[PDB]
Amino acid sequence: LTSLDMPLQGVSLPPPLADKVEPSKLQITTLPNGLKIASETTPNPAASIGLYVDCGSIYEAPYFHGATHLLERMAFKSTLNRTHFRLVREIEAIGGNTSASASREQMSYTIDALKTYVPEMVEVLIDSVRNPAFLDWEVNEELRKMKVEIAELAKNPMGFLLEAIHSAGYSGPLASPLYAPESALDRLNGELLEEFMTENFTAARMVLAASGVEHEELLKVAEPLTSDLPNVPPQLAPKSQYVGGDFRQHTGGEATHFAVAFEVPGWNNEKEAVTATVLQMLMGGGGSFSAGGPGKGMHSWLYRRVLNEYQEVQSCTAFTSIFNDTGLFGIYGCSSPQFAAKAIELAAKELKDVAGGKVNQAHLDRAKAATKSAVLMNLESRMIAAEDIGRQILTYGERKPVDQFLKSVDQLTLKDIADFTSKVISKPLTMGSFGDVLAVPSYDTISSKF
Amino acid sequence: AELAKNPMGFLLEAIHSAGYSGPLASPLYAPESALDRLNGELLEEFMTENFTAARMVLAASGVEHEELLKVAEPLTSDLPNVPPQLAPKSQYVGGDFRQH
Amino acid sequence: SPPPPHLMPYDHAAEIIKNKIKKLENPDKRFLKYASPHPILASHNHILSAPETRVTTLPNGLRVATESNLSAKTATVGVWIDAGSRFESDETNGTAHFLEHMIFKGTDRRTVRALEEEIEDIGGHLNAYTSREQTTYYAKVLDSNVNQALDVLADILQNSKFEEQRINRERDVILREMQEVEGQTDEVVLDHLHATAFQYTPLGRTILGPAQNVKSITREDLQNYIKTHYTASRMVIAAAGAVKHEEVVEQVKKLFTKLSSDPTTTSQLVANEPASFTGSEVRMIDDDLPLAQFAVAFEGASWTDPDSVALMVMQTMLGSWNKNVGGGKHVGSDLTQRVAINEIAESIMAFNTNYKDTGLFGVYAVAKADCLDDLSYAIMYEVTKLAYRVSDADVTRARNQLKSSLLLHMDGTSPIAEDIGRQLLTYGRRIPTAELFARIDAVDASTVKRVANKYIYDKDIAISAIGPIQDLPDYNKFRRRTYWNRY
Amino acid sequence: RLVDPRKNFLARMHMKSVSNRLRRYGLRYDDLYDPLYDLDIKEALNRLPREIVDARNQRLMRAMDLSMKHEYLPDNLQAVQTPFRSYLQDMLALVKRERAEREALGALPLYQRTIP
Amino acid sequence: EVPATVEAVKTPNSKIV
Ligand SMILES: [Zn+2]
């Protein structure tokens, strides 16, 4: 043909889009069985359709340990109406991509394709979640690849520590592992998965959020496939109690790790969530294992203090894991196997320093701008937009505007940062270490620092 | 590897390190990471500075003292007289073990 | 009397499994209405509408390209430069990467801390990336700070200080980076593949360069590099998101005044120092690594060659896969099917790399030592099959997947700005989606066979392997497996 | 069909003779289906629950022991045999259906026989 | 010092003899 530097002759060019497009408004339709369908029209030619369920490992207790992550692996397999092979072929015929995510309190199933294939996407997604066949050979295959997915867990110190301190920080449902032990998997099978899914996957616990489709077409395709679902009355998620705790696996060798965490308010309580996010940005930090790209957190308190005043540190940053009614704010760290005590001292001192009020307004504005730009930028993505719609309609049912969050960020003073950090570290701490723990101090000594 | 099969001894070992701080919290059963570094020279350095005469007792039940001394003295009298070192001090602090 | 068929435990289990199978025997047709496993070529030039991409050329040859989304709250603004390691010399090799390290190190107006404090005070991000033929510096900022980001970029490009102590500190940072070339084995394998495939050409040099060059780097070296290469006709300023073309053009006209205007032009540079392919291999045998990684490649196509689109379709046909993919045994790609069905790799990935005058088309795989022989057979078989047997269904499915991936990956201001800059550098224009789709659907089975017979059939290959690779087949066996003697 | 015992009496004699020959050894008709005969049988057997396959294998061992000894089952044991109780045919048919679906869409086979 | 194989693996050479 012609070289790509010359325009192709005889091509029908569609008219250009306007430089200013009026945003669309979320439409939320509730079915009599309690299932909510939401969508927003989008100018780009991509559609993201997801199903979000308020099930998770907080429902496995006591007899379904490991069911959530197995269900995550068993997504988009053989249905009662279609084989796995046929379903993969239908997804690939329209250039689609599937994904499933499992959390302690939420599961999601998403498909992404061009917006002209919405009926196929909706049909394949509902068949998948409503009609799993749970064939024994498919379950056994996904269980072998679950053993690898759990054994390679020790290769991610941040993730391993995060789960470990979730286990050591709570007592009730939140303490149930999201990565079940190997003994807990020799019991799981197709009958168990079916019994678990039928109990928890109800219409009033499920949201169909579709970013990039007209609501009329989505309703026309999805209504005949979800109304059959019966009305199941709304139960209550179980309660979890935050306690203290220490996690310690002395493996020996080198390259110790740790994570000191405290309790923070959940997603409910909508002024302090923000105080936690802005705190996380304020401490900030970085992985300290790679570099490249200014503005990623090189001038936060954690970075500028540890990585610019004390060498031989392999990782140091802050994390956050907020649930509906509770959360975990903490600080990571790698250090060196004998430098561990000094590392924990540094971390505790930093928490105490922001607790007292040793942070100036310049850093507060810096962290505030970082929070606002992080939230606004992460909404550039269509995937994140759809997932946010689904999660927020599952949790609040409203999809609160981002502007309210932006004002709370810009209503934060130093007195707020100070009182919240003071409250957070006045409560029991969750300590977790992984590697060589012999030189790592005790739980009591670290607890006495705060 | 064949130690978790006995919960008694496994817990008895774990609560030594979970309750003491310092030398007495050092495992008698080392993890399978300090083993990849153990070699004959590391054991020879450990033995030369620890297996000294003043820390050694030769005890016999069923033997006469005379010829026992007769045999033992030429094989041990040439050990150097080294000063007694103070025992490393441990501290009971209390603590918690756990593994699911 | 025999027992009834639920007394014995095994009979009961047989009954249960038989009942499940009968349940699967009768499908429900409400869920079988729309989706089809057969791929169909579809024309949907209506949804393909997009905002206009405005391109303005300044009097000095500078180009400003914007994609306006005024509903967006953010923007991405940056500079894309037709410069990289390929346009250096042997003794200057590594200078571009050193400049990438040194560019955020302060200017006459701003010191390192001022620059970081200005940026992260608005919550912005500053990114620098250099490759063999392309260099880009860009900022992700809120809609308000477009002018500030443009000022920051113009200042760092035109008025950098390059302090000698800063240069010496970065010298040791980069020297340690060279001493720590490990842990990223994919990047190492591709570097060695480039080095052996493009032997004795500028394209074969690494971005990092040799240690003696970084040791010898001084201020005047960096200033001479910027003077030689960062010229108006080689630079594109690209903005996407909440930006107006006119304001960006005015700001660029105000700020980008003291450029170089060197007459050196990229087409002449490529002409006098061309890149050629040399059939060859490098085998880094290390029997302590747990996994082997290798790449096999043919000489590919340049950016502007019409066959590049067909090579993209062919790359989609070969596909990519790793052990965490759920349905590798069922995909349209026969290579992925073979790998997933027989468990003969940890990961497989087909690549199509384009440059100004040549390219690389090949497969990268990670596998255990004992799988290597079968894996190599499968890769060569499925690549050579493209010259002999191509089904209409496979090429249709690959066309659909390629169009979908091209449109789906283009989400966010940063990917759009990168697409604008890359296209303006490689094509001289941003190819509209309808034209790209029309070029893609012109690739039929006969087109794939023709392109494969031009690039793959009976052709020299370049191999780069590292790890327990003693059972990886030698160069003659890979070379023999490029044709089929039964045809 | 002519192979229907209810409709054709010749098929009734055939089924009676086959059942009597199977009952002398305690074998089910599905026990005659060998994994080595086709990869479809092998796949169907691999998809069955373990206790069923163990029962099949035990019946095969019992039949081989009887055949080696030039003996039949005792009549008390023969009275409780169910020679035509199936455990394999439905799974075999499902495997065949999946194989045909793979072939129709142009996919590679999930398994193949070795060339001797 | 660094052995030759490590140096070769760490430094791709486009001037191979
Ligand atoms: Zn670098």
Author numbering:
A (entry chain A): 53 to 502
B (entry chain K): 203 to 302
C (entry chain B): 45 to 531
D (entry chain P): 7 to 122
E (entry chain D): 76 to 92
Question: Can I see the authors' text?
Answer:
Protein complexes of the mitochondrial respiratory chain assemble into respiratory supercomplexes. Here we present the high-resolution electron cryo-microscopy structure of the Arabidopsis respiratory supercomplex consisting of complex I and a complex III dimer, with a total of 68 protein subunits and numerous bound cofactors. A complex I-ferredoxin, subunit B14.7 and P9, a newly defined subunit of plant complex I, mediate supercomplex formation. We propose that the main role of the plant supercomplex is to stabilize its components in the membrane.
In plants, complex III2 contains an active MPP domain protruding into the mitochondrial matrix. Complex III2 thus has a dual function in respiratory electron transport and in the maturation of proteins imported into mitochondria. In our structure of the Arabidopsis respiratory I + III2 supercomplex, subunit MPP-β of each complex III monomer contains a bound Zn ion as a cofactor for peptidase activity. The Zn is coordinated by two histidines (H141 and H145) and a glutamate (E221). In addition, the map indicates a potentially coordinating water molecule. This water molecule is known to be catalytically relevant as it performs a nucleophilic attack on the carbonyl carbon of the substrate peptide bond. However, the adjacent glycine-rich loop of subunit MPP-α is not well resolved. This loop is flexible and involved in substrate binding and product release. The weak cryo-EM density for this region would thus indicate an active MPP domain.
